[PDB]
């Protein structure tokens, strides 16, 4: 394929030594001491906000935390300092943003459109907000119409693309709550901070030996992935599967990108290849009949039905089978008890769903949205990596999790994989636009923004869980980093399933090709 | 540990790049062309042979087997050329060494103990030997007996260990037949090879560098094994078993060498510290009705067992299932059919032998040699590795191969796992020499002895089978390097269970620590 398996052995990884490491810890030590130094109340919370952008927020978060505990004005501020505080899971509500709405009208003034920097800031802070709260929602909608008028004013003088309108540009393609921290933090290195008059060379400095290290330890996991694709040959037994293994790295960058995840963006990685090959065998290759036996074998779980399939279905069994005892055996490493019976429904109930499609395909019959969601976010398998990152990254469970969790999955898990689900159909058997324009009758382009809609209210369901939950902190953010990946995957064209320039250049840029210092 | 993980995961991987590979296939190519540009008959021979003791011939593999298919005179060439061709599958009887017996007597003339090159290659082609070929078995008593008394009266003369009686105390310590190739490389390189007169500078600098080129890949297959040893937290919850990864790699490196077959070293890697803790948890923690237990769960087969188990009990036997289906997918993807029974099979009568040991432990039982032997060689593990290294490196397997493998394991599978077990014996509930001191009454030098005969014996065993027979050449050759590292490590000291000075210099100079250029 596009990344043989020789290039990706050859990849001569630099950003790794005892220097490195030295220099690191250094820069760490001084950026933390610049930010908590920092006198000016609003500076500080500038700085912050920068380190965010540059994806080096990761190491200082209980620093950023205790000085937002203590931080405990115009709009530009304001819109600030509420996004960091409900970043941080604190809780301060819309009702602060009245501050400037002219409830004459119930609406927002239009001196804002003056203050590109304000509608900005509050434009970046909307996408915060929980179901509800409507004073967030026509925030949103005000400040993409003052920012559309920056663009058609300024950008139309000439390619006089100031900083300013450059940040416009990125916040209209895609609002930072939406952004993984990778891409933002190559971009806003490259494009924006090295531009900007005030730039410490410090932080520039750290953030770009950061993202560096991060990249070389990318390439020794790409390493060891591709030698395990390599020796798995699920390219020979099954012809059908594309060989998107850098595809599903990048996903997993997407998902988890600190560094003391390796392993976990290792299994991961595995199972979005695992769920791929669900997928391309369900819609693309397997017959109703193959697919019936498949999960006829599924709900069994015994080896002897292997004699009853052909040899590519032996294969995928096989591997589905070994890979959801591997899940069940770090189960058990980890927290001590045997849930091998709860992974395995995990997979019957993925099989049952795809299953379910490929019943309604080869039937003629063309279902409602509502029922196209309720089958596709859990067709999806959003659930199962869901559920490998809860028993990654939550412990201890308790037995009230446990019985919860028996008893369907969460919300935030629900509205994760629904947005997974509406992400992929976005550039791509009738599916998501298709079904609503079948029901509705609408065009095309309302069919996305109702898609749009369905997505920007399941955001607004995953931010109501960052608030007695059952989930941790960390278990959210793991949720909204799938969002936010999905949103990153398919923002412009097809990067799963298409090799075109750009999921040529954003692997470059991500993976291969360091920022120069 | 000793080999931390941290200092595995250090190690800089020092002869890799492109630079190293175009030195090592022009020096290849040189060393090619000088081999088969060789015009006299007997130095074709003698580079030959230094090639095989420098560890490169794996290389050259099909130049010299023409060249001897081509070659198809004093006692030294004679046992030269006898031992080339019987070391590659020529048919070359016992009797020509005839032409060097006192038939008037029956033995070998005395006038041998004056030409120490020509006992001391008939030492070597001694070991080559099948049974039934007696002449052999005399001409190594008399040649041991002979190079004994170059040991009393050279070395006795003074330190002057000339490179003569350096060969002589190296082939009194072992053969060359029974040494592996990287210890018998690296001491021929450092030790011998550079000190000869006729030395050429391609072929040294050539095998340095393969060497070190081999170290190099050896330590990217143990930074992988190391990291899978950390997230399989198999020490956390398994206490008793002694953390030997390295030892188990240096196992694998004694058994396959060669770059290609690294997968291989991995696999096989695991295999062995599954088998140790098998081992570990059947004669030092387990109970009897614990390991019981064990056996009952592994002949049913189900994870339901685990419920019948303590906590250690069933994380080893989850790891055990994992990874019989983990080789059974192997040979799926491989041979494109299932064979689970087998290898269910395999495992079941492991453990059933090692649970026969504890019960005879247990009962107060003192087994005879003959029996202790019949149990231990199934007992030992070593017809798992062999038939992991059958599937591995046969290919295509025939029906009747199948039918002959399902009616019990092959002859020299039973006499490798038997040097096998009689090697670990050696330098350690009553085992091979105690059983035999019970049983004759003889001291313990004697009993060594008996059993150095027994290892003997088994060797001509297996050096029938280089010679229709079921078994390709490349799996008599692993078995036979079975055997080679299984003298290998249970040499000196007890290299396997305890962490002595030998240990570490092995592995320093193994896998560490490269060769100077």
Redesign the interface.
């Known amino acids: 394929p596009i990344w043989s398996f020789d290039f990706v052995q050859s990849l001569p990884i630099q950003y790794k030594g005892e220097s490195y490491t030295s220099r690191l810890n250094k820069l760490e030590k001084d950026v933390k001491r610049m930010l908590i130094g920092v006198e000016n109340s609003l500076a500080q919370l500038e700085l912050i906000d920068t380190i965010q952008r540059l994806g080096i927020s990761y190491r200082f978060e209980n620093e950023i935390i205790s000085i937002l505990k203590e931080k405990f004005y115009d709009l530009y501020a304001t819109a600030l300092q509420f996004r960091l505080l409900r970043q941080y899971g604190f809780e301060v509500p819309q009702e602060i943003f009245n501050n400037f709405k002219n409830h004459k009208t119930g609406e927002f003034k239009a001196n804002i459109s003056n203050d590109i920097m304000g509608a900005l800031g509050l434009y970046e802070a909307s996408f915060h907000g929980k179901k509800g709260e409507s004073i967030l929602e026509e925030a949103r909608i005000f400040t993409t119409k003052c920012l559309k008028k920056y663009k058609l004013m300024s950008s139309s003088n000439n390619n006089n693309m100031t900083l300013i309108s450059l940040l416009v540009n990125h916040a209209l393609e895609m609002p930072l709550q939406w952004r993984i921290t990778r891409s933002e933090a190559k971009w806003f290195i490259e494009e924006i901070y090295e531009r900007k008059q005030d730039m410490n060379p410090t932080l520039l400095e750290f953030a770009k030996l950061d993202f560096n290290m991060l990249q070389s330890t990318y390439q020794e996991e790409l390493k ?1 992935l591709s ?1 395990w694709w390599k ?3 699920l390219g ?2 099954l012809p059908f599967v594309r060989d998107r293994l850098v595809e599903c790295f990048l996903w997993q960058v997407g998902v988890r990108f600190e560094p003391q995840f390796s ?1 976990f963006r290792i299994m991961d990685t595995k199972l979005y290849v695992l769920l791929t090959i669900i997928d391309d065998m369900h819609d693309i290759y397997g017959t109703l009949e193959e697919l019936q036996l498949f999960t006829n074998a599924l709900q069994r779980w015994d ?1 002897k039905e ?2 009853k399939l052909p ?1 590519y279905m ?2 995928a069994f ?2 589905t ?2 890979f959801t ?2 899940l ?3 189960v ?3 927290h ?1 008890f ?1 849930h ?1 019976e709860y992974f395995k429904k995990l997979m019957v109930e993925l099989c049952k769903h795809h299953l379910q499609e490929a019943k309604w395909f080869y039937s003629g019959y063309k279902p409602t949205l509502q029922e196209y969601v309720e089958n596709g976010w859990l067709s999806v398998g959003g659930q199962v990596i869901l559920m490998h990152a809860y028993f990654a990254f939550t412990n201890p469970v308790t037995k009230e999790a446990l019985e919860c969790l028996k008893d369907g999955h969460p919300n935030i898990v629900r509205h994760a994989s629904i947005i997974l689900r509406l992400a992929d159909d976005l550039g791509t058997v009738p599916k998501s636009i298709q079904c609503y324009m079948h029901d509705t009758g609408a065009s095309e382009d309302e069919a996305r923004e109702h898609i749009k809609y369905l997505i920007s209210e399941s955001w607004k369901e995953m931010n109501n869980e960052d608030g007695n939950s059952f989930f941790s902190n960390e278990f959210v953010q793991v949720c909204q980093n799938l969002g936010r990946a999905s949103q990153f995957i398919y923002q412009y064209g097809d990067g799963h399933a298409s090799q075109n320039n750009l999921s040529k250049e954003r692997v470059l840029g991500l993976i291969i090709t360091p920022i120069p210092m």
Do not use: P
Request: net charge negative; hydrophobic share 30%.
């Open positions: 060891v030698r020796d798995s040959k020979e037994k392993y080896l292997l004699d040899d032996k294969t096989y591997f089978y070994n005892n591997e069940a055996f770090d058990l490493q980890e001590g045997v091998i």
